[PDB]
């Protein structure tokens, strides 16, 4: 029952076409799931990481981006510094 969706994450001249799916019991991928994937791939904390989609700011952690308008072929911008604790 994986709700797969394709997003093009771009940051620091580095781009990935991630097929991410909802994991934390949600019917659609959400900000929590995307933040978890970003933290697993890189490790930027949710406090200072900046995800940008269509010029819309990501401030609410519970806002579903699938409802906000992410579809296949959409691209998002990742802003932050890769932290290696």
């Amino acid at each position: 029952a994986a709700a797969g969706l394709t997003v093009t994450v771009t940051h620091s001249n580095e781009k990935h076409d991630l097929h991410v799916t909802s994991q934390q019991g949600s019917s659609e991928p959400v900000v929590q799931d995307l933040a978890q994937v970003v933290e697993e791939v890189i490790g930027v904390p949710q406090s200072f990481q900046k995800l940008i989609f269509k010029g819309k700011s990501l401030k609410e952690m519970e806002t579903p981006l699938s409802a906000l308008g992410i579809q296949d072929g959409c691209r998002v911008m990742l802003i932050g510094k890769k932290n290696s604790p």
């Binding site: 620091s12 580095e14 940008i52 269509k54 010029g55 819309k56 700011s57 691209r75 802003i79 510094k81």
Partner: protein, 290 residues
Amino acid sequence: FLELSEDVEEYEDLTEIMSNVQLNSNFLALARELDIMEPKVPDDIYKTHLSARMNLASSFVNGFVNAAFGQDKLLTDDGNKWLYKNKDHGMLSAAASLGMILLWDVDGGLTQIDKYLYSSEDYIKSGALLACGIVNSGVRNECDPALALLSDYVLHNSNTMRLGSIFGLGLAYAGSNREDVLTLLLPVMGDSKSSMEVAGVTALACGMIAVGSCNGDVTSTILQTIMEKSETELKDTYARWLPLGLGLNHLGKGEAIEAILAALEVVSEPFRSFANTLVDVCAYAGSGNV
């Protein structure tokens, strides 16, 4: 930017090359091929073989030389030390100069300005936000990071922070003619708490965004803001940006300017005689009207 549908063939490449995404990569590649990449120091430009404002000018010319490159350690490694050593009002311009170095470099510029975004001084924060707008200026982006990045600062109460965000959005959406950007910045134009020069900068941003578009609501907001502002405080030294926005919005059109000047005829002579002439010449630019 031409806004079209994906039904056309190879639409992704067409919108990318229209967005100038590969502009920066090609420009750096050719600069390296010419070997013209080395950051030229402002000092050996000055030929010093034989002060706060002078150091500021040195930082500005360094940014001018290294513009669109993004390769300058002078404001990257010890940049925080340089701005800390800098005095008074120049930290905003130093950070904007760093954004000038990083212009058209979306990915690299945003990461190297993210650290300076959380700076302590209001001038450094505003300069960082203006640096972001310079970085995204000219080059178009699919997700348009500038709009989301400038979220609280677009109408932020602090004058300097609002000024940096507004100028950044103006440089970014310059020629985009984006309805969302216009519908978000024109209400900022309608703010009364902002200073006279802040209102002028909002008009400048609106004019450069809606240049050559004859945006009626932008013009109505410009005229309404001029009317609401009292004439005595209008005509001092800074209302000269409102006619500039009008001229940009009606750039290269002509003829219809009679309606704008007739509406503006209510203004007193000292500023009306300046504003109507400015909007007229900007609208009739490139025509040879003897």
